[PDB]
Symmetry: D3
Subunit: 66 residues, 6 copies
């Protein structure tokens, strides 16, 4: 924590402390859902969803898995 | 168990599905650390850190409250 | 690990092992909700709620973000 | 939400909103460690540790899994 | 920041990297639920559930302790 | 919780309660790492690792991202 200073880039902070446990999802390019402890789950593997957004915050790819 | 389509904004997707469990931290403005399971913890409350970055990804505020 | 002993205070245990991944919320003074993967979310930041309780486990402060 | 009020007990708040995603570990009676993404892990199940504290925040029970 | 190679067993990978943050629950023997942020919670402790499944994926023990 | 009974398959339980918050990683086919709050992080995106194991518990694929 003394390992960081105002003016550092996200790369410099992440090098010092690691990436954070949480961050705000708005403005970022990738959102990942894992649908746990939600009734109605189906299949032989954990349902997940990866969403890709462009720099304007618009959804460009929907990746279901499976 | 709900409907999205390409071209939706993040507000539309969050209304439909909720915010995601995880998202990529690079490019956003607020990072939040909670230092768990790390030896050397001190104090009477859980140590945390909130960082604010500007539109360019540079750190402008370090909030260690506590405290 | 072997670096903890019965009789230790929560500070000593937290200095040896760090705080735990999880703990029972009853009896503590601060609760933190993060409303994720819940349809109906609104706004331009992640909705959260920080509740402060006194010693008697009574709620004394409600802190919504964003502000209601 | 609007379904909580200052003066509520932790039970009333938990009935209205559920327990929180996170809480401050200090002051509670049970801590639970899950040692993941930590090099050195051994054995055939996930290593965990459950610590029980009394009212004074003093450790009274250590429960390692698997058993040491 | 540590070294794995194809052909390693899960014990070898866990020694090198630790266990993973997440894994697929299907096919294993122990499931653990912690019911957070769900309205209608009752009791003086966090409600949890530990389920044991046999090698075939069938439920053989329901542990609701608490209690 | 009264929604489940001994003898149900993992598919029946997951349909009633959802998948669990946690499960034991040994014996399963996919392990996912997200290296957060670990100093030394590098890059312009969150480092992760997906490992695939066969039914004998042997590592068959290493997928770094990026």
């Amino acid at each position: 924590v003394s390992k960081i200073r105002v003016g550092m880039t996200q790369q410099q902070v992440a090098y010092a402390l690691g990436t954070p446990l949480m961050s705000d999802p708005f403005g970022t390019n990738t959102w990942f859902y894992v649908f746990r402890q939600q009734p109605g789950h189906e299949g032989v593997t954990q349902q997940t969803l990866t969403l890709t957004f462009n720099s304007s915050g618009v959804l460009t790819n929907i990746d279901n898995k499976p």
